[PDB]
Ligand binder design. Structure first.
Ligand SMILES: Nc1ncnc2c1ncn2[C@@H]1O[C@H](COP(=O)(O)OP(=O)(O)O)[C@@H](O)[C@H]1O
Ligand SMILES: Nc1ncnc2c1ncn2[C@@H]1O[C@H](COP(=O)(O)OS(=O)(=O)O)[C@@H](O)[C@H]1O
Ligand SMILES: Nc1ncnc2c1ncn2[C@@H]1O[C@H](COP(=O)(O)OS(=O)(=O)O)[C@@H](O)[C@H]1O
Ligand SMILES: Nc1ncnc2c1ncn2[C@@H]1O[C@H](COP(=O)(O)OS(=O)(=O)O)[C@@H](O)[C@H]1O
Lengths: 590, 562
């Protein structure tokens, strides 16, 4: 005979044996058939073979030779309990839906199963007798108030409530979804139904009431000193932008992320950039062995990494796979090229909440804070715009036209998340303080509407990885509640440092994003290149036959205009926003 | 109530509704118990949910308040037939093992099934008031053939009535034009512009033609190229593993000349060998391609070096391959397509196929992996595991042992019986070798998945090589296996990963290496083998079969004469 654990490998797609019996009981019309039908549908929609035993299939076949003549009812239940045990033994979730009114017959069904090592879940579908008669779903209670039916349970014979059911469904105070969810959650607690990977925000901050204690704990551990870009990835993790990571990636997660751009355990989750912690040979041999250590930034213990695992940082290969180049003068690759040769994964418990105390912490909303803000503005669509640059009206055009399309589709309260990145950025980019001041101005001028625009700062370092990075950009906003993700040309790219051509082809970011796995709850809203049209005196989308109508105004052209004291053409950038830049460009030359 | 067709889709790893009842009847207890156990084993070995009702789970449970009166026995068999119905309706193959002596009773059990549109198979376990069935679907003579032959007869019947798939490997899409359309297609090819291709490109034309890259319809179009480089899979219409670009390159000159055209012919050695239809041209970004496929852009990597010499366009399209690819070098007999391999495995009556990709001479370390896989399968209840020894035959780097010499070596290894020729199919995989480690190992695996392998063996540093700059392992040696074991899109086969095997001095054989015995282990590389041949030494006894080593000294001698 084949073992259960072998039957578990071939019953269904998900591995592991999960045979068991979900035993529904309660009065006629309490809700058993309704629950079973819906529970079955849930299990099947999730790849879990199940079979339902009910009146339709038992009392009309196996049990056609029994009535409700209280011996018959014992024998009913007994035969059902035996069948159920055989389904459960075969590896199915067996759901049984019978009134099953005797406490002794149900316990017997329970012992038939516990005796052969099969889980048994007694679910009391509990509606007051008067409610069940209200529903009289099949016309039986009236057929029995008239006499014409037996000792119908609840009226003429007894129903004995279960004493310690695994779950009581109060079907007069909850809906069917409430029932299904309570049962499914039971089966998840008891390892019959797996908990699939989720994008539900998962912070890695310790709770405030556990915080003091965790700090004291942290103080006893070895420590590892981290730097600022590390502390900003500490923040990305803490706040949940890399949900469902539990900490810095372990080997397995790292390799998934680099080869497939996804995490794969428990379901496909897009996560296309390594979120890792590096260490030197020296730190590894020092910390390896220890079940916990603390991470220290600017002499403060900012987090604890528990159950840590050390694996090699193969850096040329990492770089080549993440960036499509191993060019040493790419500014992030250069940082990676200086780090250690080990990476460290583990479970990260972050302590004090991360504040940078620079005048900008009011913008640094967590994904929870952001979803609250949308809820409070009552948005019915959130479009997100990642940017790392001053907003010119070419960007504003992508934002305005996405806003138009949402309206045209029926949304009535579209909100724009204007989402500049504020983590590490390469040397020649405009500093965050300045870009925030510049977008404030675009908004003060009404190029974008302040009453429908949330402005906040995305804490991730920037990688400048093009079509790899953009997925990361997008998935982060997805976690924070965005339903539409605006993407133009060359997102996340830059010039190749050696050749000066674009590192990445300009349509790939979008093409890749639109077909990347894991990006299921948001729609990609992609755009062609916009540039200053000279005829119409505004930004518009570039067209082939009019190469000459269009001026492209580089970041180098702006630095140049500001310095020769001129102005970009009219329609390129909100005048006040422009001024902030001149102000920026002024302190730059020094 | 969820439908059969939907329960069907989730019951097994395989899909299709295949609920039914195999109803054994007859006197012989051992007959029925032996067959039903063995059927059960076979179904489970083959991914089909089943459940056996017999004395041991019915007698003392469901039918325990029944005794031997004629009514009680009638009822005994009624209750079993109803319960079997429930398992068949639930999508399981329900196997019933009771004497069930009377026609009335078996006829009723059938009717419970046929009246709910569930197949019922009355299998008469016949071995000399039992009432023999008048029209059973199978007569099993258990006294006169073995259990495995019986179980085969059942399995055949279940194949015939579409319960057990004839197949269930991934369906192969060949790109060859069917032979009835050839001469025509050859004529049509003659009217079109032509693009001359080289030998490596012709190898990939073969890879495509024969179906190894199923479901591509030809050289990769942009979207597929981007899926393959970013995600290691094709995604459109289902995730399947494909981690290496399968592409045709072109110069600026050739692109200009051909972009515009709706079909052109591929030309190898003056012969038109294919038409590419509805072509699209997209950039060959070499540096990025390289970096993402190989995890390095090292200009001296030998396949990277060829990609860097190719043109800056790629051409995707629908590929129709004309004459069968034959190389006329004395090895064509081993060049089996996925279709011919699947037929070869059927003809051998395999019930498990383990595939071993390789590019090197087989030492007894490799054989050990193969031998261990073959043991693991025996134990899991497979009874005719067949090994596909599948040397790669496409382009390989300059210092590798040539295909012909390897084939003759491999032939020596089977002649010494380190591998059994009777359970072993030797064939040549036609792909070029990329030397891309964990990225390429997925290509190696998927291609064999398409050829119907069920288990795919992988050891240390698969598809790797020394980094040409440092001589250090270009790849981390455990990665291939770690990546492969978790890679998406390879759901119809099992990966069997192995730790590194090396020569044990103390045991005088190849065994798995152990940290705390470092010293007993001798690692003999290709370099060391060539050094040893050149001084007239043999490697230790147990490392390589003698006749196979002698083939190698012949090879190393030929090198020396040059
Ligand atoms: N939360 C609930 N769970 C199940 N049924 C509910 C619930 N709330 C209201 N109902 C209604 O009560 C009725 C219960 O009917 P039925 O499932 O067939 O009961 P039973 O199988 O217990 O005889 C249905 O019409 C159902 O829609
Ligand atoms: N005597 C009765 N008491 C309760 N239900 C009855 C009775 N007679 C017929 N029925 C109907 O038979 C159906 C199935 O009852 P069961 O769940 O199988 O009862 S049980 O108590 O023996 O578990 C119910 O919808 C029920 O209304
Ligand atoms: N002028 C352009 N036309 C269309 N889209 C653009 C243009 N410039 C930038 N984008 C898009 O605007 C967004 C942000 O631009 P950037 O801030 O420069 O860099 S990125 O690193 O955030 O993309 C991305 O979607 C990017 O493709
Ligand atoms: N000594 C060894 N021990 C374990 N695995 C090995 C050893 N040598 C090679 N392998 C594995 O054997 C297979 C064939 O290896 P090779 O022919 O050297 O090269 S490969 O390119 O085809 O993988 C691969 O799965 C590889 O990982």
């Amino acid at each position: 005979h084949v073992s259960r654990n072998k039957r578990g490998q071939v019953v269904g797609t998900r591995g592991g044996f999960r045979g068991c019996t979900v035993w529904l009981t309660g009065l006629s019309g309490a809700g058993k058939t309704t629950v079973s039908m819906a529970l079955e549908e849930y299990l099947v929609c999730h790849g879990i073979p199940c079979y339902t035993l009910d009146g339709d299939n038992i009392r009309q076949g196996l049990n056609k030779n029994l009535g409700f003549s209280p011996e018959d009812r014992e024998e009913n239940v007994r035969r059902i309990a035996e069948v159920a045990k055989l389904f459960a033994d075969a590896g199915l979730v067996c759901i049984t839906s019978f009134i099953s009114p005797y406490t002794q017959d149900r316990n017997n069904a329970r012992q038939i199963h516990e005796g052969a090592s099969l889980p048994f879940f007694e679910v009391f579908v509990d509606a007051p007798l008067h409610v069940c008669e209200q529903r009289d779903v099949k016309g039986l209670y009236k057929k029995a108030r008239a006499g014409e039916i037996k000792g119908f349970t609840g009226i003429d014979s007894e129903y004995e409530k279960p004493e310690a059911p695994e779950l009581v469904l109060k079907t007069d105070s909850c809906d069917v979804n409430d029932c299904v969810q309570q049962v499914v959650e039971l089966l998840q607690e008891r390892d019959i139904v797996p908990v699939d990977a989720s994008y539900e925000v998962k912070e890695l901050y310790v709770p405030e009431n556990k915080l003091h204690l965790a700090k004291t704990d942290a103080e006893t551990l070895p420590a590892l000193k981290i730097n600022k870009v590390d502390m900003q990835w500490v923040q990305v993790l803490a706040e949940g932008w890399a949900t469902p990571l539990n900490g810095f990636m372990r080997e397995r997660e790292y390799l998934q992320c680099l080869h497939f751009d996804c995490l794969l355990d428990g379901g496909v989750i897009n996560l296309s950039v390594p979120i890792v912690l590096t260490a030197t040979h020296e730190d590894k041999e020092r910390l390896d062995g220890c079940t916990a250590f603390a991470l220290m930034y600017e002499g403060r213990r900012v987090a604890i990494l528990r159950n840590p695992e050390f694996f090699e940082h193969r850096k040329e290969e990492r770089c080549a796979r993440q960036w499509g180049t191993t060019c040493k003068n790419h500014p992030y690759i250069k940082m990676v090229m200086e780090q250690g040769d080990w990476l460290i994964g583990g479970d990260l418990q972050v302590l004090d909440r991360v504040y940078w105390n620079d005048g900008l912490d009011q913008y640094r909303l967590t994904p929870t804070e952001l979803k609250q803000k949308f809820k409070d503005m009552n948005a019915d669509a959130v479009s997100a715009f990642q940017l790392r640059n001053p907003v010119h009206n070419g960007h504003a055009l992508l934002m305005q036209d996405t806003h138009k399309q949402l309206l045209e589709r029926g949304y009535r309260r579209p909100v724009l998340l204007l989402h500049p990145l504020g983590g590490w950025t390469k040397d020649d980019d405009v500093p965050l303080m300045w870009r925030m001041k510049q977008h404030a101005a675009v908004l003060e001028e009404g190029v974008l509407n302040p009453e429908t625009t949330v402005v906040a700062i995305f804490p991730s370092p920037m990688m400048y990885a093009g079509p790899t990075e953009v997925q990361w950009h997008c998935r982060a906003r997805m976690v924070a509640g965005a339903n539409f993700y605006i993407v133009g040309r060359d997102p996340a790219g830059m010039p190749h440092p050696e050749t000066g051509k674009d590192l990445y082809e300009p349509s790939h970011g979008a093409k890749v994003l639109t077909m990347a796995p894991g990006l299921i709850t948001l729609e990609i809203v992609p755009f062609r290149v916009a540039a200053y049209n000279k005829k119409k005196k505004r930004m518009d989308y570039y067209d082939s036959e009019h190469h000459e109508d269009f001026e492209f105004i580089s970041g180098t052209r702006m630095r140049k205009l500001a310095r020769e004291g001129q102005k970009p053409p009219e329609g390129f950038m909100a005048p006040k926003a422009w001024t902030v830049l001149t102000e920026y460009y002024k302190s730059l030359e020094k």
